[PDB]
């Protein structure tokens, strides 16, 4: 409905007790002008979990499309039973770092000229459908860093445990 919960608060690590220097960091997959973070495989429970998977999307060129895939609860039995995505209203709402904690923010207020198509393949542009996309504008004047969380770290299969996925989108100035 586009409203932000001003009281909501979280952290990159969540409850995993993993510190930022131990994250499994990795770049997005950048094909022409679509940058993708696919969490299908990265979040399945394993013996070594909980791990933090941090998919880093870095943009400094015009009209890039960002697509984030977060596997749905029950899309495969057992694997994603306890998965949670934050913010619920992504991509309209994102998270940003304010005084060392992650808080909700409107993406359109953060980057002027943002295109959000209401529908992705005739489906709602929302994580409840397993994917979100947006398109960055032709010109950006302010560096900007915002986050998505696709946390499967509360799913357990015996001694196997799912992972917490982070998307860090880092927009730099461009278009001059």
């Amino acid at each position, epitope marked *: 409905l586009d409203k932000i919960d001003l009281s909501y608060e979280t952290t990159e690590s969540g409850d995993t007790a993993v510190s930022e220097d131990s994250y499994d960091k*990795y*770049a997005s997959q950048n094909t022409n002008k679509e940058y993708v973070c696919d969490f299908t495989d990265q979040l399945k429970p394993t013996e070594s979990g909980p791990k933090v998977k941090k998919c880093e999307v870095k943009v400094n060129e015009p009209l890039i499309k960002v697509k984030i895939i977060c596997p749905l609860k029950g899309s495969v039995e057992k694997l994603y039973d306890n998965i949670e995505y934050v913010p619920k209203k992504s991509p309209y709402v994102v998270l940003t770092k304010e005084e060392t904690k992650l808080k909700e923010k409107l993406l359109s207020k953060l980057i002027y000229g943002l295109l959000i198509s209401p529908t992705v393949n005739e489906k709602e542009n929302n994580f409840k459908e397993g994917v979100i996309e947006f398109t960055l504008p032709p010109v950006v*004047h302010k*560096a900007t860093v915002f986050y998505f969380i696709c946390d499967n770290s509360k799913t357990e299969d015996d001694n196997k445990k799912g992972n917490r996925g982070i998307v860090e989108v880092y927009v730099e*100035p461009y278009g001059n």
Partner: single-chain antibody
Framework: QVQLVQSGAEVKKPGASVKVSCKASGYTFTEYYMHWVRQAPGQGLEWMGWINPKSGDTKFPQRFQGRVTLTRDTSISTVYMELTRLRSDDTAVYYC????????????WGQGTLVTVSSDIQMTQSPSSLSASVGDRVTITCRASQNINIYLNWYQQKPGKAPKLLIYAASSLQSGVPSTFSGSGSGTDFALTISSLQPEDFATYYCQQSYSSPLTFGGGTKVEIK
């Protein structure tokens, strides 16, 4: 268009201090972190730390914690690097370099300031030196002691010049670079490949990891003429 201009050469006695400046023109100063990188004569590149100019926040590695202080003046888009208690092994050329996405790569470099004092991920490059000829295809290897995914960049440096960035993200060709250059690798092992050596590809080539702090450089693949 983007420019970073630094103070002149300094001559110091051991026990003194040195302030080096980096004026920025051509872009919005506050939107890009500024790092410092030094180079002893005939040696490799050593990262010194970064300042965020919106906030003044610094980040240093243990080698320079308490040795060096980074300040900035947003009034005039300038950054200062003060190094205290100078000793002879501090003789070197000090570069300010503008970070892209904080520290992903260093597209833009200053001209360097020579300071002349009187009297942890390892990057591994092979070969150390080589000789070749126009038209030859040359392959250089770089090797990380840890998985760094694609957080790897390649730089060309000519004598008396700041490093040019040629490749970032392991295999992205920087704008304005001859397409004879290419990069490959993901994880621990990387290759820089020049399809046809042209007369001004004769230089020293460096790889550099941006995965985790401190930022470290390979020690240099020098590419000579016969």
């Amino acid at each position: 268009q983007v420019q970073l201009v630094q103070s002149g050469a300094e001559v110091k006695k051991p026990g003194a201090s040195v302030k080096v400046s980096c004026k920025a023109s051509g872009y919005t100063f506050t939107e890009y972190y500024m790092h410092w990188v030094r180079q002893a004569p005939g040696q490799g590149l050593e990262w010194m730390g970064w300042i965020n100019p919106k906030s003044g926040d610094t980040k240093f590695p243990q080698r320079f914690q308490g040795r060096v202080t980074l300040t900035r003046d947003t009034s005039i888009s300038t950054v200062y690097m003060e190094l205290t208690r100078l000793r002879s092994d501090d003789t070197a050329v000090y570069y300010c370099a503008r970070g892209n996405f904080r520290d992903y790569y260093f597209a833009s470099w200053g001209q360097g300031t020579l300071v002349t004092v009187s009297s942890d991920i390892q990057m591994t490059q092979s070969p150390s030196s080589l000789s070749a000829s126009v038209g030859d295809r040359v392959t250089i290897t770089c090797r990380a002691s840890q998985n760094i995914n694609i957080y790897l960049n390649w730089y060309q440096q000519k004598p008396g010049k700041a490093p040019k960035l040629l490749i970032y993200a392991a295999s992205s060709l920087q704008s304005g670079v001859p397409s004879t250059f290419s990069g490959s690798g993901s994880g621990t092992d990387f290759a820089l490949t020049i399809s046809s050596l042209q007369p001004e590809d004769f230089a020293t080539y460096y790889c550099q990891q941006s995965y985790s702090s401190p930022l470290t450089f390979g020690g240099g693949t020098k590419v000579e003429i016969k």
